[model samples]
Target chain A: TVTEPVGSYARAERPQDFEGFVWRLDNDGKEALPRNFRTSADALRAPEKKFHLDAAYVPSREGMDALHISGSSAFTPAQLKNVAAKLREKTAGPIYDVDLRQESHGYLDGIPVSWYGERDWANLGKSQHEALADERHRLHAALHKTVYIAPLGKHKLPEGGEVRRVQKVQTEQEVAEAAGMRYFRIAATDHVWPTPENIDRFLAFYRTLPQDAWLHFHCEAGVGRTTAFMVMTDMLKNPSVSLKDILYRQHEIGGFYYGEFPIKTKDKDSWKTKYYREKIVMIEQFYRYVQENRADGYQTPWSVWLKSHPAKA
Target chain B: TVTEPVGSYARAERPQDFEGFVWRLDNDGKEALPRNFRTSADALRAPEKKFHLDAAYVPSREGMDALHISGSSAFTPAQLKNVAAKLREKTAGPIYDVDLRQESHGYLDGIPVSWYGERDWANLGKSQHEALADERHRLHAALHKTVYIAPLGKHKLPEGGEVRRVQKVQTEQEVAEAAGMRYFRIAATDHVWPTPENIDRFLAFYRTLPQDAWLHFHCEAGVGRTTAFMVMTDMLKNPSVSLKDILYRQHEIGGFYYGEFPIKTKDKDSWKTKYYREKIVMIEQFYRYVQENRADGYQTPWSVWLKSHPAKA
Candidate 1:
């Protein structure tokens, strides 16, 4: 089911590929969905908060602490580490001395490379490199000095600079086929429990964090799981506190969370209950001692937990 | 500037216009946004966690509470109240209950029978008595089972099954002019912070309440401002706490909150400092109080207040 594209341009390379990914503009031969689609006037016209592959594929120039990428792809062992180092420069989250050379890409590490002509050449070309470089540089010039990438390792290979080696090729047919796959399953849309799959994955990734360290996840759009991971990470990190200060700081970063579902019920019963359950469950195990004992005359109830924890983070 | 409808329907030759307001639906149109040029879906897409007029509007058999009725063509006092009530049903935000009847209509036993129309007419073939009966049936139909007639002097004026009464007519242009003149503001969105002006009016309203009764403010949306009022109101409602809960509950709500505007800046030299100053000040106050009295730990600043405060009605 998982087909790899070693060489191709744009989505044409990944015509049948479910996970839409490209190295850079060169690989992305045709015009793809732009990164900040929400703010664009055209996007606003049809505005349902799109979750195209673009949102899931872009890698951050930042570090790999809670990166939104695959942990493995084709590159020199040191080159991968070097890429991680470059990312660390942009986002100084809880990045440690990571050695990509030492770590093995797990079951999910295969590069979904794109293809060109009869076959795909899996290496970065100058155009893709420039596209990637231009995206970050333009972003640095406009929004802020820092550039945010999506979680990585789906189907992209960054050669160097802006050059990302195409690991997947999408075509008109592939685009149609890929549409059925939920590559960007948890985009800006809001779901209460976020289905067990996403919640479990998020919980697993977050449970491994250091108490003082931070876990960050953002797309170029910077709204969906950025909010999700921020909350999940906050819960895991500050197990002692119910609500943190950084909730308000969301807007401080020019970013806010966007729920992805319609408010159908009167009391939003389904969403509310799911939210409460998720918040409590995500951190309940971490603070088992507090839950076991009525420590400090207070404990983190999912209802009360988020009030203070991320208020400042 | 507030130009309301001034047609024969404004005078209502029959009583149906007075009572059977819902009958107006047949005369006036109510189409979804697709046909309504004024309502761009883009303008209506609201962020989940923030307060926006467009965000809280829901679709149902009861009709939309949050709709852009062209400009400011005035409806009868009844129509105005109905809209407010409908909005309250969807989102428990503020309602600008404007009774233009007070400004224009002259009342006889609370019924503004003779007023605004320059020279009250008898041009229609219908007798005045027949008209009154017709209006009564119309009101009954408009109210249906929801008890829309309760606040209107608690008079249940039911009419015969059929009565003829002309309804009012006003253009979008007229409505616009009137709004410039008679503006009634409401916070019918999510997580709205009442302006200083709104705060004063709300506090004045709250003062009328007795301590024993907990006035609850939940319509379809749960305790948003009810919790906010718990903080911002005289005793200090935990607005932030309510927002934190809202954000957590709507973690997937896409969009960001700008303090006063929809932008965030880190540099202290920015104008945004003023907007964030109050929040920072509030947090500093909590920390200060916490330092002074360690036992008075502000565990859940928002919820703690919500639980203690007099609920809204």
Candidate 2:
């Protein structure tokens, strides 16, 4: 039998109305679905309004707050505050801030160590560090600054030329630890598609968690890598669901689908050149990874399977 | 047959890889897909990139480019120029600018006619008009303006405090005629979905166009209304295509899928609470309207069907 509340979102096969369309998989056919997660955040989803919720919501297994999906971590001070507040408002349990950005990002003690640095692996002198910290905060701050009439020194100068550096801030394991949420700091992908090893590692990570674990997958725009993880998680939980359905449903829920369009390429045969092409391959591959294991009775955690089948990792 | 080039982009059946994914339905399976059309422009698709093309392109029916899919007209000056030049480069023929914003928008001469006039139906004085023209361009310009350091007078003031007002500009039919393209101007929707009447009218309008019309559907961010029209057009051209496939593929190509998720609401039964519910209904309704007619030999053009099947319309 399918587990009740098997996955985060409730979907239907072909119910008629919008109301009928969103029924939960394990519903008694009468209970209302819970409303804990949203699709996008207002500050993050700027310019226009579309989805009802700014952030996509994922209710807990026993129906507690589990996850929140969003674009890149709000790097700017205000945006960061807005993101944290909204995440706080939405979830009940401690948050597990999952960063999928392959790019250099994250902050330590109020400083954006990753995004502010020029070389992802560079070592900086205190003078250089202060200069970068200043540039890091101001550049992105001014980058989104509206109106030339606004004051130039509008941003607080960092003590020692470094303002509170926090843009590109992510992987705050302490934040999760403070709340006692799971400590999940992983780099899923930048914008590129996942490697088999990437898929295996993520699968291993997902399996390591209890079914009730709340996961918040964040990448640059919450588009590619973020989307992939959602589907990957969904596939693991609801292996019986059709792959296309999983792909499309997650896409409808604000995650980007990995399926490439044929029209963009006149190749008319293959979109081999597509940068994220492996995503679909990996999408299907992961689908099999879950379904085959479930079907084969290998309830082996993906981590164990990786060790048994070394190539999968 | 399928009118050769059914709609703007090409879609396929369950082709396996990303390569087999993007084939034009009309392809003989040997010739490569055309390289003219793209999905999103760089300036438009920021943060992290997914689709290869910046702007999704449609080859003309003999494929001269009857349509282009973009967000609300590039209201920004540079974005406008970039969009215009790309349109020019892609289409062998002239261009038809289709504006689908229900809000006040468009420009007259150098002025944004609708957006600038706050009172949608209000008349303005010379001073007010000039003042609006000033605010019209500058507000949006600043809205996206990135830096406090970027000079206060960065925007060129209009001769009378009214700089060249051209954000939210559209419906410049004269511009189309000048280039010798189609003169069809239409408004599809704002962010909300379409009605049967809306669907019927759009279907009728689409029917009237020559098979090779390049229709660029733009709403703010080119997400909702623009996406609906793209699907509508694709359905009409390729009536045999599955509705879910059409919906999913369009979402893949850049249009937002209108289907709502059930999890967002604990309703577990319906997204009846969703703001864009009608979009999915209209999507399916349009599908039936096109498919049934084609199956029943009612190729009598959607415009004519509105008369006999008045109720359906």
Candidate 3:
């Protein structure tokens, strides 16, 4: 039965609206999410490299681009199921997962925006294990209502410390796979440049994926490394595509802080600073290398080529 | 014949240490000024661009590198004299002045860091004219000791406002030229992307500058735009120099918030966003265009080429 008088608790129950899932809410008070799934696909299928793809991909908010995904670092079993279902619903195609995060610490704490605001887990003054357990408890409650996981034992809270309240349930990839979807791991930090070896690994995996598959990319905040791969994939699909147009399209999809470049007023065009230039030049050079090699009858695959021509230190 | 017991009053008399002229005091309690000028000239004479040019360019306590020259928005006539004298003493070559501020409002207020604290002009609560007059009074007192610029102006304070007595002085370029140095004006903002037209104008002017001339570049804080021009000039001299190395060397010299890039973490190699990529791509394209066209027997100068190939709309 549809319940009435569901005001404050309504959002508290929604998996997407939970504390860490949503980055920002839209005008309808709904949580922000990745947009331009099916619409951007048309642009992706274009034969010409210089077509305006951004014209079709409408962003949900300013700076909400392909790089910045909307979700928490990790998800509960049920949350993961919900994510898979939604991905299928949004794209109307088979979902393919790409996880770009270090695997060892896969379930690490979602770095809070502040240690003193509404989401300050640090303020609980708990042991690291206990704090992590508390987070796991919250995740469980958010997904399964009052159903507790087995092998759980109760413990009294210390005078001022929050303690371990729940045990680890399931890995995010495990849940997504259980939901009957394909998952791929590409562990890398958002801030670090991917080594050529890893790039080759990604390219090899990318070449195997079907063109029409719903390729869903995710990282901690869903903004940084995810977008990098998205741009790279676009280039991989169409070698002659204008990088600026693709970047501009991503910006329109609510990325790059609403289209502002990470540049100081003076260095915007000076091209002496590295924040923007190096990333572009490296990618541009790679594209050139790929094209030139293709013309020269270089039969080696990208994976093999990367092995011989690794990035300089 | 230096006088004794001149602690606070001594700086009130020196043109360089006047209010707003220096941000912090040096070890001996004197205002910090640009240093290691003579030492830098030795490195500047080296034919190779790969050499560390910034090794000898020690920055002031506030800003760094060859670009960040120290001074306020405008200068007093006496201050100009001192500057010209110091310029000659610092370098044994002809002086070329590069002004990176727009002409009409070249001497507008240096947008205060905050509405409160060590430098808070907003707290004065005076009319724009009076506030400007107050700054003029301080500039006058700092330069000429007790002799005031005449006309004896008066202003009534607004409610809860403050006002001071003073007169308008002279333009920065006027004094710069009066000091017997060549001056060039290239107007631009600190927080906006520069147009291709302005860049072409700069390149044209730069080609005319003698290689051995003591090329001095300056903006308000001597950081942002100044550093950009410095990088460009360096590129013009040595087209093959790594942009990263030049920026890193500049950071060591002190600009960019005392050598910090606007990065969130220590990892600087991430290609997560568009800021750095766009800058490098645009520059790389420009370089490629210039080289390819030059090889194709295009005799049109940069200024003319820029007009024909005005950047994509």
Candidate 1 lDDT, tens digit per residue, A1-313? 2231111112232212222122222212122321221111011021233311122222221222332221212222233234345434545444322111100111011221121111122212223334234334432332211111112221222222121222332221222122221111121112222223344444444446454332223322334334444444443444444432323222123333222223234452443443434433433332443343345533334323432332110
Model 2 agreement with the true structure over A77-196: per-residue lDDT tens digits = 233344455666765654565655443333433333333211111112222334335334543553321111111121211111121222233234543444444555444334445544
Error of 3 at A103 (Å): 5.6
- DockQ-derived CAPRI band for the predicted complex in model 1: incorrect
lDDT of 3 at B106: 17
In model 1, the runs with Cα more than 4 Å from the true position are A1-87, A90-192, A210-214, A240-244, A257-313, B1-313
Candidates' chain B TM-scores in the order shown: 0.24, 0.52, 0.50
Please give the distance, in angstroms, between residue A139's alpha carbon in candidate 1 and its true position after superposition.
29
| Pick by TM-score: 1 or 2, better one | 2
Candidate that beats the other on lDDT, 1 or 3, i.e. the better one:
3
Worst 10 residues of 2 chain A by lDDT: A18-27
Q: Order of all candidates by TM-score, from best down to worst?
A: 2, 3, 1
Could you give candidate 2's per-residue lDDT for residues B1-313 as a string of tens digits? 3321111111221111111000011111122211112332212222112323223433222111233443333242233444456666655544555655443333333332333111111112122334335334533453321111111122211111221212233344544444354544343323445433455566667656654345655554466667777777766666665765556556655466544433242444243233344444445655766877877655565544544443311
lDDT of 3 by residue, A257-292 (tens): 212234442533342233243444445545555665
For candidate 3, write residues B89-109 as lDDT tens digits.
765666766666531221112
Two-chain DockQ for model 1: 0.00
TM-score of decoy 1: 0.20
